[PDB]
């Protein structure tokens with residue numbers, strides 16, 4: 001797994017990339033590579049730190065220290081000897097996919113648009129195989145590297161830019177209802193098939209360039225109202241429309257993700273093989 005206790009003084013601050021638990025910094029790993037040294041993302045937990053919050057961070061490492069895929073974020077090192085506890089990952093110079101695509105209609109061709117979703121299906125193909133369930137697959141949870149390289153991460157609700165993407169249902173628990181299957185927002189049934197339904201919405205997002213929020217005309221209460229219509233299956237449900245620059249075949253793939261029955265949905269192996 002990750003390098004246990006990397007020397008902290010080997011990390012040179014460049015800039016903080018978020019403050020959601022402590023804050024995330026861009027750092028230069030100083031000393032002995034080729035031309036440019038390795039730049040990393042360092043997530044350091046707050047000083048105050050309550051036992052449960054301290055435990056939450058170590059639970060994040062427990063989950064993150066099992067992932068090893070070219071399309072999954074990578075946990076390089078962990079500074080765990082003395083406080084603050086840190087978790088070190090690689091750096092995706094082009095930020096998140098939602099922010100990246102929003103700036104394009106710059107231009108990314110169909111081949112390269114298809115290439116980003118294939119890597120997402122590839123990275124998702126991995127998670128399934130470890131019996132892991134992402135629960136929140138969206139372009140905001142996708143990081144962009146060099147030459148359209150996509151890595152899947154999990155940021156939670158914390159990124160305040162994406163607050164109107166999560167619906168508070170009980171206490172501090174929030175839901176990405178526009179990406180979730182009916183059995184996910186009715187029965188709380190989380191499966192690879194639920195992640196597949198998120199993949200169809202993540203592909204829709206991609207093919208729309210993150211310019212339109214999923215279910216634009218519907219509200220946070222109209223979206224949960226729509227889940228029941230997917231279940232009732234009486235032709236009173238609304239699906240995402242076919243994007244303008246999306247082949248008939250890609251929207252057909254999109255549809256199979258949103259099919260009512262869990263078993264009737266494609267696997268990530270099927271999805272990756274089509275893509």
Ligand SMILES: Cc1ccc(CNC(=O)Nc2cccc(F)c2)cc1NC(=O)c1cnc2ccccn12
Pocket residue numbers: 017024041042043060063064072073087088089090091092093095096127134143152153154155
């Ligand atoms: C440093 C760091 C630590 C913990 C995370 C959060 N992630 C996850 O937990 N993932 C994950 C978990 C389970 C399944 C899965 F599939 C994934 C992330 C980061 N790193 C960044 O935040 C970062 C990296 N490059 C950039 C560029 C711009 C902005 C931020 N970063």
